[PDB]
Design a protein around this nucleic acid. Structure first.
Lengths: 106, 144, 197, 68, 170
RNA sequence: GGAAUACUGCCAGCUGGGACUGAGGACUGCGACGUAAGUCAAGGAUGCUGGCAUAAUGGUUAUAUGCCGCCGUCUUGAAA
RNA sequence: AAGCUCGUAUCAGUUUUAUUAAAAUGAAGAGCUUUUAGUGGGCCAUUUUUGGUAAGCAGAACUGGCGAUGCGGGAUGAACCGAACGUAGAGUUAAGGUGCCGGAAUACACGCUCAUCAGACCAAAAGGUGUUAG
RNA sequence: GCCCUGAAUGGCGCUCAAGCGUGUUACCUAUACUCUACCGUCAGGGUUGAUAUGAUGCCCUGACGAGUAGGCAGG
RNA sequence: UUGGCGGAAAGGCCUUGGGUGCUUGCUGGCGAAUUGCAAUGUCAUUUUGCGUGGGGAUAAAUCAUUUGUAUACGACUUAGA
């Protein structure tokens, strides 16, 4: 088959923040196809992986990955809070992220 | 001097498998070597893993242990009552080129399972096609 | 969902269209705007024309060159409205603006590609019936735009040869419908209807 | 369908059944589309796979008919 | 969504005057607590008895008997504003009294800037017979075979983009 | 004439999904199940596993990214 | 800060008779000396309020905020709104907001306005064939 | 009730408003609040026929933690 | 490989002809494993160098001399095998 993607793609909007102060420890992730928090409930707890390429080959591969989890819904437009072992660099706002279907409960 | 640990009060009670996981259910692997391949559920192992088969003859997936949390359970159930899976256990997968005994068991299990699959039309083709998402797909809407 | 979204500005509101596009730009989605000269603004012509002159007055008290300058093209007017809605003078804002393209009419190759519209920014679906509105074309010309005639002249050439493409497409779809219609009711077609297809 | 102003529930049901609006309603593209969307949602992954096989088979006949 | 409450107070009894007049009135409020407060406020404006010497004998909700029939309601309202309180009369066509009175508060706030505290509902009575309605905008809906379209309908789009160029037809 | 249904309040009713915490460190006590022996979710996490044997996660620092933001004394009501 | 007496009928910036008993709430933080650094600017608002002519307000006193003060909002802002601070993880909120900058609904319901800088920021008693309900 | 004369919004921007008056639901947050991890102060209590860490020690419990001049204690 | 259209940023869009692969439109014969229960499990994009193999063309500006329609000083405009 032409398509092999087994994950739902999304875009990282920005960190949880107030008008002035921001909280880098929490990130807001937009999931394609989600419109309301009720639909976003399915994605809660799903693993979140960010993939970026680095010129220097590390451990035999040039691809580096950061892992995270879906924590809770955000807003009334399907936005969902996300957390990672290491917070995103803040330079990836609007960048695509991979939301896997595991751990699945269906 | 060393100090002993306090008497912990916990019980390793048996896993409460989700209702959607029943033997003979067609599974979909989300990660690993055979990620995206459609698989048939056979038996629940002692170590909480799931004993599964492709079957091997259909898609090349051999008898493997798979985690229940990395699997999507479909509603398509193939008869598995005639397949004996009592031989396989935790010690069967204790590693440390293919072992001869492994091949013999694979064909024996496949023989019984292949006949059941042949009943429903297109089932053999269905298991031979790797699952993958397409544009416009939404897992929360997609029924499984 | 679409790597490059092409938005037809005809019949849209600059404020609503700019705000919707601005958020997408900050979200990493590339957007292209076409037919900006046909964009509309609420209120009758006098109010929109008068307000533009008032803004032009405050450009700079002592030296216009050492300050801002007024762009007459309709696309720049939309860009100015969208620019104020983006965090300019920042790496994120500057990078986001690079994802946006605005042109008058539909220059190629966008003419051969599908173009979408924003339902929540159409004049028809937002302006009360019977109320007056202003079009960027007249407003842009009134403030010194010297390319309205050229855009209108060559836009007709764009309108022409596109109905011909649709005319060929319409005839082609007619053959497909006949081929599909005759193939209907077959064993495969009948079975497909059971599964909803 | 004909109905008197202020008709009670019993009268509405009597007129509703007589007019057979439900039968007429279902025999329309607008009503049919609703069923089609609902039907596509309940399709199991196995059923969805069958659609691909059936659709391709129909495509061969449809395309074979064309070009002649 | 207000509720219709009936409140009775009897200026707690004293020896040689048992069972006082037991003033009775109907109050519309969102809850019992709000209804009780309004009852005390109205008393002090008409009956000089105060909450200290007053008592609430009973309170029960009055549900509309037939919340299906469409009824024309004639309402007399006394409301306060920058100037002295002015007598006002209005007619509302609604299924139930509680529904009709709710629309009055919205109209007063819009067309008169009055609020709940500044509005005193005098009486609500059904117009049991046709041709008794005086306001033109209520007689408007009484014409036989009244048919009218809903031109320029707008569908609230869910997605941010639309390829159809939707039409407002109905 | 009898049924619900809506609203309020209760359940020492049931049943899932997600997020953080694992602090104490040999038994002493309050409790549940079992006729009993004993077990337990009962004064704080335990039971297995996969890769790291290319041994890294990580520590310091240059830059970049999202947000925030000249000193010491002395006035008055703070800023000055 | 020490000592003494006493854990409390010892009282309280608390609620009511009476001509100061007692009843409720809260607390062992109650009382007597003995001695001892710094402290005499006040600003703003509230109130009793007398004085007055274009004006404003001045002035006597009382009660609160600041004065020694970080935090969120108020686009920035003495004295505005909430909130009185050890270092951390998790969740709900105060005031403010939910078209972008800006994290949150281009939410719903009812009305209201074309303004040739509208609207979101006291000289206005009256004028207007402007609009809407009485 | 709203609009212009009745004198000379933060920006982008907006008009069945993204303005005005009211009501009904969803959500963001402060060092605030609720649960939990750690440092110290206070208060309470155990401690010996004493345990090598030694009673200035070993512990269990609850609360608290802003600050100019100034005072005290530990480094 | 024939022919046509597209100058707005055409830099692309379509058709005659035969050649060569797939064709899951339909029915069959074998391989998948030990990546050991997952680690994005590496499958594209813009730029450059060194290398071969096959093609193509194979020059100018400045400084200098000199000059004035120029020139505060710079700068700029003339002419030459």
């Amino acid at each position: 088959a032409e398509s092999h993607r087994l994950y739902v793609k999304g875009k990282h909007l920005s960190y949880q923040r107030s008008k002035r102060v921001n909280n880098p420890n929490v990130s807001l992730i937009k999931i394609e196809g989600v419109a309301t928090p009720q639909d976003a409930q399915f994605y809660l707890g799903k693993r979140i992986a960010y993939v970026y390429r680095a010129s220097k080959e590390v451990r035999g591969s040039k691809i580096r990955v950061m892992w995270g989890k879906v924590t809770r819904t955000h807003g009334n437009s399907g936005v969902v809070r996300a957390t990672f072992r290491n917070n995103l660099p803040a330079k990836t706002f609007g960048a695509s992220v991979r939301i896997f279907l595991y751990p699945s409960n269906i | 001097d060393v100090a002993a640990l306090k008497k912990t009060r916990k019980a390793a009670r048996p896993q409460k498998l989700r209702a959607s996981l029943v033997p003979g259910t067609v599974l979909i692997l989300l990660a690993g070597r055979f990620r995206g391949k459609r698989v048939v559920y056979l038996k629940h192992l002692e170590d909480n893993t799931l004993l599964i088969s492709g079957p091997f003859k259909v898609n090349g997936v051999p008898l493997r242990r798979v985690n229940a949390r990395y699997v999507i359970a479909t509603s398509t159930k193939v008869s598995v009552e005639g397949v004996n899976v009592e031989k396989f256990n935790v010690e069967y997968f204790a590693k440390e080129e293919i072992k001869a005994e492994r091949v013999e068991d694979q064909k024996v299990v496949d023989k019984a399972l292949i006949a059941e699959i042949k009943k429903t039309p297109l089932l053999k083709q269905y298991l031979s096609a790797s699952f993958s998402l397409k544009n416009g797909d939404k897992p929360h809407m997609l029924k499984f | 969902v679409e790597p490059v979204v092409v938005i037809d500005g005809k019949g849209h509101l600059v404020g609503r269209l700019a705000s919707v596009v601005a958020k997408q730009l900050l979200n990493g989605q590339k957007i292209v705007v076409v037919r900006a000269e046909e964009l509309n603004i609420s209120g009758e012509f006098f109010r929109n024309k008068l307000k533009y002159h008032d803004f032009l007055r405050k450009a700079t008290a002592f030296n216009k060159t050492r300050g801002p300058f007024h762009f007459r093209a309709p696309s720049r007017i939309f860009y100015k409205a969208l620019r104020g809605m983006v965090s300019h003078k920042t790496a994120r804002g500057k990078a986001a603006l690079e994802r946006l393209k605005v042109f008058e009419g539909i220059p190629p190759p966008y003419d051969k590609k599908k173009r979408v519209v924003v339902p929540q920014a159409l004049r028809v679906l937002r302006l009360k019936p019977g109320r007056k509105y202003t079009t960027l074309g007249k407003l842009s010309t009134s403030v010194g735009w010297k390319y309205e005639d050229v855009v209108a002249k060559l836009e007709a050439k764009r309108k022409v040869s596109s109905a011909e493409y649709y005319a060929k497409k319409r005839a082609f779809t007619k053959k497909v419908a006949s081929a599909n219609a005759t193939a209907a009711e077959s064993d495969v077609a009948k079975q497909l209807a059971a599964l909803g297809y | 369908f004909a109905l008197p102003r202020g008709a009670r529930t019993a009268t509405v049901s009597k007129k509703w059944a007589a007019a057979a609006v439900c039968e007429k309603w279902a025999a329309s593209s607008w009503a049919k589309k609703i069923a089609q969307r609902e039907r596509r949602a309940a399709l199991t992954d196995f059923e969805r796979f069958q659609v691909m096989v059936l659709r391709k088979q129909k495509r061969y006949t449809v395309k074979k008919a064309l070009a002649k | 969504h207000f509720k219709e409450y009936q409140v009775i107070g009897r200026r707690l009894p004293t020896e040689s005057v048992p069972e006082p007049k037991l003033f009775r009135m109907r109050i519309f409020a969102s809850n019992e607590v709000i209804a009780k407060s309004r009852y005390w406020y109205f008393l002090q404006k008409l009956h000089k008895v105060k909450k200290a010497s007053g008592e609430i004998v009973s309170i029960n909700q009055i549900n509309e008997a037939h919340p299906t029939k469409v009824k024309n309601f004639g309402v007399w309202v006394r409301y306060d504003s920058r100037s002295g309180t002015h007598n006002m009369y209005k007619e509302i066509r609604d299924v139930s009294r509680v529904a009709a009175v709710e629309t009055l508060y919205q109209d007063m706030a819009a067309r008169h800037r009055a609020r709940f505290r500044s509005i005193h509902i005098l009486k609500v009575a059904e117009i049991e017979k046709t041709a008794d309605v005086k306001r033109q905008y209520v007689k408007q809906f009484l014409t036989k075979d009244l048919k009218f379209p809903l031109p320029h309908r707008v569908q609230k789009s869910t997605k941010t983009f639309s390829y159809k160029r939707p039409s407002t037809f109905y």
